[PDB]
Design a protein around this nucleic acid. Structure first.
Lengths: 990, 202, 200
DNA sequence: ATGGTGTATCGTCGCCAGACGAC
RNA sequence: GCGGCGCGC
DNA sequence: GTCGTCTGGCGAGCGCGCCGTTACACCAT
């Protein structure tokens, strides 16, 4: 019932905001009426009972107990826990505590049921225990001191006590890290951070400062008016409740009035000039109010000080000058010492959320006024509202939006604010992140956090990760903690050049956008009389294109400005990137704007804060990484790459010394900015006195060719297939992209032997680049539609004839990849067909496909039709790519966990492993070892057994279950390829 | 000159000064609303219809005819029927289904409401521009017309008269529009008053 | 079930069996035409008019109502009324003005002709697909429909059954037509013959 | 310096979820 | 929420 | 009414970010 949910939310917010007599009066009014005593459940009664219990108030709690007795309900363990907690606060006679313990022992309730089944705070548990110790001083709880340890086959050596322990440590002392924690706490207590922009500053003239002054006085008047309106609304809502009616007064009293008016002013500042829909604004205001309440409760509850103390104790493990009695993983150290853990947030009902948002929006619209005329003449003293309701058209619907006054928009445009705004969760952390200990506790301080980013579902994903035993997630959580404990810093030398090109006519070929002043102007203007029938009609065609180009340029410059502003904020600071995962298991950083899963500019601006000496082989790996980023030699062995690096050393030194003045050899590569960064690093390393004693901060990358086909070739143990994906050792690396390109080219020549024009047009216009993305994403589940879109996008950047609808190139790519399957990758075709058929037959029986990774992470597919039926099309076309993604995520997590034990700094881009230049060989050995160890287990047999146990278990529909069992017990036979040879392959990851 | 832009069918001025009743109709993508006046600014009726089978993807004209006939069946008789006129054009290709729905409804209302058109040749259904109404009521900010819920609330709680027995239900109906805003219900009354001020009684 | 995929409204077959007279109407960009047939497949009437001022750059319901009223004034009463149902799509971003013209034409013709609909809810106007016309007579190539001037020359200049009184007028109309796509309006007669063949 | 008005590209395909026949 | 783009695998 | 075969409409690999939702054209005290 909606009214019951509203009343329960009212009472919970009352006990959150200490407005207990108000809730008591409303409860009494509802209990008195015979028609209102119904739809009242025990949750409201014992919520008010616990609120009375928290601060003395024995008489009121006894009266609430009397109401519960008169209502005809039966009290539960939570009510008795509340009763025992009040008695503790103020010491009371022994007989009363007992005259209650015996009553709880009667009627079936247990003495220890409240301690385990009922979730209460530490203070409440301590008060209840002190209330029981008055009667029974010998009562005690089991300690359960030893934590559980994962004992799976793949994760056995990670958690083994015996062995060599070489866990890495940070380069910063304890006091500096404590100051960084304080800075992060002060930043995150506010919900918003202001950053100086990178756009070239304009000198403030007279009218600019006049606009700024009138903005200041308008904002002061708006703040006063909003405060008065909030006070009047609060008084009206309190008077409404005193008449025994539900209102939003406790929800409006969640925060201080200053915080609410600041939030309203900030959302007024960010409101678009054209406008935004009223419902979206209401939802945003309600969500911001809830988040701010969650953050600012922890100041007055006292959790901030406890978190500070436990953080200061925990950072002795990561400090350079501090030591621990026994080295251990960060999550295990945080699990000890009695550190607190975040509790799951209880979301509000949707109706009260929407009503609070609409109330705040109406307050903002009514309370804000401005003078009608911006001019100095103040005739007639006319005051008009700033925001109006406009019933406009959005999508193919009619929506009521909120629109500002054009005078306000002109005033905001005239006074150019040089400050951008960001959310505290959208910026990198200024202190080391919290260890991941649960799906709902980790990463950011003092803020709700979700382990999984899946917006769709989110109630079945979070149910499978909280039902499984806690050990099964451990190898994931540590892998998410290890990726979070990587200290980052900003390379300022690259940043100077990037901002130099940004604050000028930009260079779009290097990846920096251009200002709107260089938008393509129309060739000419219109005329009154058209000279030709073709005239006066193509002007719109060649002008709307220019407008679209200008809009795209504006969007690109906006995103570049945001990224560079956030990068310039963190120029002289060390920051950390907390990580989450999706439902498949793929890992992503939490800050979206500035991270290493980005373009060339974003990756070149990021460096390791901690550095290591190059050693005997660091410089060679740096040069091989530079050649790899250059892209000139991808089909050559490593020794020829090193020789090429030796040959072009003059260009490297010239690019490092003169990036934008002399020769520009770094321009002309696939990643010019990372190439320039590597050139500077190599130039510094060579010119040092000892090239092996040079400390390098530059990450070196090792990548697989096609990590989807690399897994398909190994689940089927396919012999000739594994040769093409470098699973078999060879002196020369094998490129699958060039072989597909060659096959499509020769069959295009064969088709052009016959009479076709599209084949003859595509003579010499097909290369590795046009097919690389498509071939890479075939194993990821692309269709011919998406493949054609990708090929059209790639062919719209050449000198191709205007026949850009190439439906033949995608057909040839799919067809001759399938022919390559028929020749050498037959296991891939067999396994993909088997997986698709199994997913289809599971979907037809009204079920969603669920499985478990070999690391123990449960995965469920959330695609459902608009309880609801599964979407069979999305359910059966996504199972093999999701399985491959789970497998490669498991491989990456295993590699990270086994590289941490050897003192390596490991960070992961999908399929790409980045580490220090002195640790490349160790990481390669660990990667090959974990790939052989992952595939030495019967993955397909275990999957079939799980799908025969989970699905195909009910005998109600025997006819479908029979075919399900025969298809599920039809695993393809493996080939004759030997897996151990992967340990001796040099180009498996390169 | 002003009446040419205000009113498109261009009915001669003598017929606009002898009216005894008027029905104002505003329809949207989800609902329709209409209001009745009897030359004394007295609201005889004020209704809206919300439940529709239209604008769901299928532009079948049979359900259009059935729905329009069911709406007209409840409409009483009057001297003239004023219909709203949106500013949408054929250039905006993104909003074409809305324009198609509006044009089909306007054509069917013109055909069905003009019961005795063929025998006399006189028009009984009028099209009024909403921008002119917004300019008349000072509801125009920039090039966009703003809502008039507060002005209708000022009316309900000289300019317009409400029958004594018919007030409270109307007020309750207004109290049914607090959670979700029905702009057509206010726009119908606003257009009726704009017609009685700009063309009649001028 | 075949008629459900050819006729848009869910009309009953028992009413289509007991028919006496049909009007078939086809409208285009510039002109309209219609034909009156009886149950004996006799061509009582066939008339085309091109006095439209509807589509001159401005769209207005008043001029549409005036022109449609004038046209429907010169039409005899018949049992059933049918008109073309060309299946253009909203998804295509072109040919919007002709689609809007077609929908406004269908709307006012549906309301204006379905007399006594308020008293009794019976649909006296129907729509039938152009593809059914192009497939039953088999004069249409794939994904198109070719002209049928040769077919109406085959009938004139037994299924059509032209009357003896007005045969000279029809012959004069056929002979004097050499442009303006008269066969694109004789698709009305073709559609009416197809309706008699399919619905009976 | 502004407001006055103005209106005729798609090109695939396969497959599964609602729709109508038999009981 | 829709459309136009861009980046990563 | 109910449920088994058939056909016609649906939608296109995920993850992240930005912007926009409403042609500009001719003219003169």
């Amino acid at each position: 019932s909606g009214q019951q949910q509203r009343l329960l939310a009212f009472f919970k917010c009352c006990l959150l905001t200490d407005q207990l007599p108000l809730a008591h009066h409303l409860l009494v009014v509802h209990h008195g009426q015979r028609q209102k005593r119904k739809l009242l459940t025990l949750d409201m009664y014992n919520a008010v009972m616990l609120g009375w219990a928290r601060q003395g108030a024995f008489k009121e709690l006894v009266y609430v107990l009397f109401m519960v007795k008169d209502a005809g309900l039966t009290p539960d363990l939570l009510s008795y826990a509340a009763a025992l907690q009040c008695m503790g606060r103020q010491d009371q006679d022994a007989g009363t505590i007992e005259r209650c313990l015996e009553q709880m022992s009667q009627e079936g309730l247990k003495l220890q049921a409240l301690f385990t089944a009922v979730l209460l705070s530490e203070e409440d548990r301590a008060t209840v225990l002190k209330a029981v110790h008055k009667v029974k001083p010998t009562f005690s709880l089991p300690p359960q001191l030893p934590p559980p340890v994962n004992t799976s086959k793949l994760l056995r050596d990670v958690y083994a006590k015996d062995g060599r322990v070489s866990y890495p440590k940070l380069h910063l002392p304890l006091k500096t890290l404590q100051c960084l924690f304080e800075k992060q706490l002060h930043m995150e207590l506010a919900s918003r951070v202001c950053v100086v922009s990178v756009e070239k500053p304009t000198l403030p003239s007279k009218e600019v400062k006049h606009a700024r002054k009138t903005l200041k006085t308008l904002r002061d008047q708006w703040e006063k008016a909003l405060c008065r309106a909030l006070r009047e609304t609060k008084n009206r809502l309190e008077r409404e409740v005193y008449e025994g009616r539900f209102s939003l007064y406790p929800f409006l009293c969640l925060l201080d009035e200053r915080e609410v008016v600041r939030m309203l002013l900030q959302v007024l500042q960010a409101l678009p000039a054209q406008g935004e829909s009223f419902t979206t604004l209401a939802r945003e205001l309600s969500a911001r109010t809830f988040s701010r309440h969650v953050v600012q409760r922890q100041r007055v509850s006292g959790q901030v000080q406890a978190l500070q103390n436990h953080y200061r104790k925990y950072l002795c493990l990561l400090a350079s000058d501090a030591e621990v009695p026994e080295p251990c993983l960060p999550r295990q150290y945080w699990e000890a010492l009695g550190a607190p853990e975040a509790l799951r947030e209880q979301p509000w009902p949707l109706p009260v959320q929407m009503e609070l948002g609409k109330l705040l929006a109406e307050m903002l619209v009514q309370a804000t006024q401005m003078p009608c005329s911006l001019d100095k003449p103040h005739r007639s003293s006319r005051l008009v509202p700033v925001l109006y309701h406009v019933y406009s058209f959005r999508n193919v619907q009619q929506i009521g939006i909120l629109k500002p006054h054009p005078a306000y928009v002109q005033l905001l445009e005239k006074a150019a604010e040089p400050t951008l705004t960001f959310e505290a969760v959208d910026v990198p952390m200024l202190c080391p992140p919290l260890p991941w200990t649960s799906p709902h506790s980790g990463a950011f301080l003092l803020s709700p956090t979700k382990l999984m980013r899946t917006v769709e579902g989110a109630t079945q994903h979070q149910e499978l990760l909280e039902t499984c035993p806690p050990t099964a997630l451990h190898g994931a959580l540590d892998a998410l903690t290890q990726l979070g404990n990587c200290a980052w810093r900003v390379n300022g030398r690259v940043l100077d050049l990037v901002l130099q090109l940004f604050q000028a006519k930009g260079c779009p070929q290097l990846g920096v956008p251009a200002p709107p002043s260089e938008a393509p102007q129309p060739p000419e203007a219109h005329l009154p009389h058209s000279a030709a029938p073709a005239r006066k009609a193509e002007l719109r065609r060649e002008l709307a294109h220019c407008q679209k180009v200008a809009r795209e340029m504006h969007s690109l410059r906006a995103e570049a400005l945001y990224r560079l502003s956030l990068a310039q904020h963190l120029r002289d600071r060390v920051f950390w990137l907390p990580h989450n995962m999706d439902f498949r298991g793929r890992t992503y950083p939490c800050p979206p704007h500035f991270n290493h899963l980005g373009s060339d500019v974003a990756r070149a601006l990021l460096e390791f804060a901690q550095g290591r000496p190059l050693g005997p082989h660091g410089l060679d790996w740096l040069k091989i990484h530079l050649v790899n980023l250059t892209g000139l030699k991808k089909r050559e062995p490593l020794r020829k790459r090193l020789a090429f690096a030796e040959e072009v050393m003059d260009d490297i030194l010239d690019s490092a010394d003169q990036p934008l003045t002399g020769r520009k050899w770094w321009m002309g590569a696939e990643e010019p900015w990372q190439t320039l960064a590597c050139c500077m690093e190599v130039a510094n390393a060579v010119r040092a006195s000892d090239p092996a004693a040079y400390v390098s901060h530059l990450p070196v990358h090792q990548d697989g060719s096609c990590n989807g086909l690399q897994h398909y070739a190994a689940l089927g143990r396919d012999s000739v297939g594994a040769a093409s994906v470098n699973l078999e050792p060879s002196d020369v690396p094998q490129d699958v992209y060039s072989g597909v390109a060659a096959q499509v080219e020769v069959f295009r020549r064969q088709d052009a032997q016959r009479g076709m024009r599209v084949a003859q047009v595509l003579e010499g216009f097909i290369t590795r680049k046009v097919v690389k993305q498509t071939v890479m994403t075939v194993v990821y589940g692309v269709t011919r539609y998406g493949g054609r879109l990708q090929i059209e996008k790639r062919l719209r950047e050449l000198s191709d004839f205007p026949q850009e609808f190439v439906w033949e190139a995608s057909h040839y790519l799919v067809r001759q990849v399938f022919k390559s399957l028929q020749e050498m990758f037959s296991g891939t075709r067999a396994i993909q067909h088997w997986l698709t058929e199994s997913a289809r037959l599971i979907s037809h029986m009204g079920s969603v496909v669920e499985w478990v990774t070999p690391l123990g992470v449960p995965v469920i597919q959330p695609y459902r039709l608009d309880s609801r039926k599964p979407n069979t099309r999305k359910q059966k076309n996504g199972f093999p790519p999701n399985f491959i993604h789970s497998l490669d995520s498991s491989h990456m997590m295993l590699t990270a966990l086994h590289c941490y034990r050897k003192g390596l700094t490991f960070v992961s881009v999908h399929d790409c492993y980045w580490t220090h230049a002195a640790d490349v060989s160790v990481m390669n050995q660990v990667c090959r070892e974990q790939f052989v160890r992952l595939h030495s287990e019967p993955i397909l047999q275990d999957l079939s057994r799980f799908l025969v146990k989970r699905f195909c278990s009910e005998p109600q529909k025997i006819l479908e279950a029979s075919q399900l069992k025969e298809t599920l017990q039809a695993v393809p036979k493996p080939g004759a390829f030997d897996l151990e040879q992967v340990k001796r392959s040099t180009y498996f990851f390169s | 000159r002003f009446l040419r832009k205000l009113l498109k069918p261009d009915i001669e001025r003598e017929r606009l000064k002898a009216v005894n009743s008027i029905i104002s109709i505003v329809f949207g993508t989800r609902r329709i609303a209409w209001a009745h006046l009897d030359r004394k600014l007295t609201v005889l009726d004020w209704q809206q219809s919300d439940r529709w089978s239209l604008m769901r993807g299928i532009y079948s004209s049979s359900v259009y005819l059935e729905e329009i006939s069911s709406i007209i069946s409840k409409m009483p008789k009057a001297d003239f029927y004023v219909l709203e006129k949106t500013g949408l054009s054929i250039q905006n290709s993104s909003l074409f289904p809305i324009l198609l729905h509006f044009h089909i409804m306007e054509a069917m209302l013109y055909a069905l409401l003009n019961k005795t058109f063929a025998q006399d040749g006189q028009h009984q259904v009028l099209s009024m521009n909403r921008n002119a109404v917004g300019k008349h009521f000072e509801l125009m900010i920039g090039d966009s017309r703003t809502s008039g819920k507060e002005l209708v609330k000022q009316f309900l709680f000289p300019r317009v008269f409400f029958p004594s027995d018919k007030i409270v239900h109307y007020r309750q109906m207004f109290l049914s529009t607090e959670l979700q805003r029905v702009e057509e219900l206010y726009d119908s009354l606003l257009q009726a008053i704009a017609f009685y001020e700009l063309a009649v009684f001028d």
